[PDB]
Design a protein around this ligand. Sequence first.
Ligand SMILES: *Cc1c(COP(=O)(O)O)cnc(C)c1O
Ligand SMILES: *Cc1c(COP(=O)(O)O)cnc(C)c1O
Lengths: 396, 396
Amino acid sequence: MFENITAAPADPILGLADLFRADERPGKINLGIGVYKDETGKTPVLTSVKKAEQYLLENETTKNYLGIDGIPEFGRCTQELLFGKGSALINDKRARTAQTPGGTGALRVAADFLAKNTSVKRVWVSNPSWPNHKSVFNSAGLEVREYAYYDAENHTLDFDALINSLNEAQAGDVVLFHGCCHNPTGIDPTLEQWQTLAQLSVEKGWLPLFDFAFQGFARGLEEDAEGLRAFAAMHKELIVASSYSKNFGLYNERVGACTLVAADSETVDRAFSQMKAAIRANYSNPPAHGASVVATILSNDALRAIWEQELTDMRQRIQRMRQLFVNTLQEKGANRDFSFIIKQNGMFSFSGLTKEQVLRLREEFGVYAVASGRVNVAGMTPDNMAPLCEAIVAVL
Amino acid sequence: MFENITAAPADPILGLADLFRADERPGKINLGIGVYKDETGKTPVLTSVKKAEQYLLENETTKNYLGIDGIPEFGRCTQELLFGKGSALINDKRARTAQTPGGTGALRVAADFLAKNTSVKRVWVSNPSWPNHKSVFNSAGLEVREYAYYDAENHTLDFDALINSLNEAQAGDVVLFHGCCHNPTGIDPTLEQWQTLAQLSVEKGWLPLFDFAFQGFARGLEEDAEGLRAFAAMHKELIVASSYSKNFGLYNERVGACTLVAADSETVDRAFSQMKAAIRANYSNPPAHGASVVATILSNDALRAIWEQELTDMRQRIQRMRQLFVNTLQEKGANRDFSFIIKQNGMFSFSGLTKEQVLRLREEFGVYAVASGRVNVAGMTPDNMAPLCEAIVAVL
Ligand SMILES: *Cc1c(COP(=O)(O)O)cnc(C)c1O
Ligand SMILES: *Cc1c(COP(=O)(O)O)cnc(C)c1O
C-alpha cells in the first residue's frame, strides 16, 4: 500500500537550513529563518515566560484534560487583546474563542469549520503570502486564489491593482488579510486603506479572515490591531486566527487561538458548537503549558509589565537593524536605493535580489536568504552588518 | 454565512459531566469520566513527571520550533517501547515516528496521510469502539464500518463472530485494533487469538492500525504490546498511533506518536515525507513540553524507575477495585453474576445495565455512568464501594 506509490517535495524554507550549517566558513550568515534572534544570534526564552513557568511548576495540581476550547481566561485575554477592553463584540457576547496549537492550527480549524458547515468553497490570499497558507486551506477542501498586493518594481502596495482584483471575488468568499504586517513583504495598509477594504467587504459579501501573528511587532500591541478593529466594527461576521509564538517566544509550545465574531450571541454559539466538533475530530483538546503561560502573564500586572517590555525590546531591535542595514549598504556599496527596508515593519522583508543573486550569496559568500529575496532582518547582529553588506554589494 | 445555518449535538461522554456537579447530594459518585482517579478521587501529576519538569525549567535555553516529526529521542523511545529493544523493525530502519498532539492527533494524521497518499477508502472499527474513532476517520474523508467483537449476553469476544465478519473486508482496507485492551468492554484477545488475526491480515490484505492508549494498564509495559508485536512480525506495513496521556498522567499536555512500519527503509522514508506534509498542513510542528517530559524520564534510569513504579501503582489499584466491586455486589445484593468485571483489564468496563438502569442511577441515587453501562472502575474509591453497590443492587 505504501510501496513505491508515494512522493516528496521540500516546503521551501525548511530546505534552506540543513544546506547551511554544512558550510564551516563559518557558514557565516543565515537569514530567512522564521524566528527572531537577538544581539548574539540566539532565540532565548523570555524572562517573563520563565517566571510564569516556575509559577506553574509550583501550582499545577493536575494535568487532566482541557475543554475543547481551551482555557477560559486565555480566551478572555486574547479577545481583549484583539478587540480592546470594552469592545462591544466581547460583551454583546458576539465573539467566541478556541485555543488552538498555533497560528497554523487555528487556520486549519477555521478552514475545516468553514469547509463543512458553510457554503465557502474559495479563499483569497495575497501575492505573495505565507507559503503554508495555500496547503492549509487546500487541505480542508477549499480553493485558494490570489489577489495582487505588491510589486517589486515600486516596492509597495498597489492599492489600485488590489481593490481592482478583489472585485472577482463573489459574495460567499473568504478574503484573508494579515492584521499586523505582511509576510514576506513587510508592507503596511494605512488605517485609511483598511477603512476602505472594510467598507468593500460589508457592501460586497466576503467573510474577513485575519491572520494575526506579528502583534506588537510593527508599532505596538494596541496600534497594530486597529486594522482588524476597523474591520471588526462594520462587520457582523469575522474569523481571526492568532499566534502567540513570535511575540511571546513560545514557538515550540504551540499556542494561538481561533476566534469568530458572528452577529449575536445566539448564533456565535450555534456556530462555535460545530467549530468545537471540528477540534474534537482533529487534536481533541489543546496543549495546556504554553497557553497557560500566556494566560497567567497577561493576567498579572507585574509579569505583563515585564513581558510588554520584552515585546518593546524585540520590536526596537528590528527597527534599529533596518537603519543599520539600509545605510551600511549606503556606506559600503553605492549601487541602489534600498531605502524601503526602513519603514517596512516586522522581521521579514524583500531585498530586491534575483534568484541568481540569492544563489550568488549562498554558495561562496556565506549569506543564506530564501530564493524570493526575503531576508529576516532580526537575523542581523550588529557584527553581521558590514560583512553582510559585503556580499549584497558584491552582487549589487 | 454562519447565520441560523448551523447545528449541535453533544459527544456523549462530555455531556455527562455538567449534568452532575449540579447535584449537591453530594452528587456522590461520577463514574464514566475518561481519566483515572486514586484513593481520594483526584487525578495528580506524577512525581516522576514533576521531577522532569524542574529539570526542564532548569535546562531550556530556547523555545524555538520543533521539526515536524518532533523530538528525536522521543521517537527512539516510543518505537523502542512499542517493538522491543532490538526489534529488527527499529534497525533495518523500517519504522519512522512522528510526535503528535495526543492519541487523537495521531489517528487523524494517519487518516489524513492515508486519505491522500493511498488507495484506502474504508476502515473497520470494533463494536463498540471509542466514540471518537468514527468522527476522526470520517473527517479525513474515509468511511468507517463495524466488525463484531463482543456481545452482551455472554460477556466476552465472539472470536467466531469476529473473524466471520472481517471476511467482508477487502484487500485495500484498514482494520483498527486496540493493542492493550479495549474501550469500553475491557476484553482481551489472547496471544493465540492475536496470532490468528495476524495471519489473516497477511494472507488477506488489510493494513493494521493499532490504537495504543493503555500501555502498561492491563498487564505490564512489555506484556501488553505483545499483541502489536505478534502483528509486527508477519507484517511489512503497519501504523500505530500511541498515547502517553493516561499512563503518564499527561492528559492536557497532548502527547502521543504516529509511527509507521513500511517494509524497507527506502519506502518508510518516501511514505514518511507525505506523512510529514500532512502535519505541516495540520498543526505544523508538535507541543514540546509534555513530550520532552516523556523523553527525559524514559532516557533516565532513575526517573524511569520511579515512573514504572507509578505505572505499576495505577494498574494495581484498578485491579484491586474490580475485586472490591464484584464481591461487594456479592456481599450486599445477591441478584446476578457480575464476575466478568474481574479479569477484564484497564479502567473501563461494561456493567450489564439497561439504559433505564443508567437513568435510574443518575437521577436520585447519585451514580453517574455513561448510557452504555460503561463504568470507569478507576473512579471507585475504597469508600465509594458500599454506597456504589447500593444503587446497583437497588436496580439489580
Ligand atoms: C508564523 C505565522 C503563522 C503561524 O505560525 P504558528 O507557528 O502556527 O504560530 C501564520 N501566519 C503567518 C503569516 C505567520 O508568519
Ligand atoms: C484515550 C484514547 C485515545 C486518545 O486520546 P488522547 O487524549 O488523544 O491521547 C485513543 N484511543 C482510545 C481507545 C483511547 O482510550
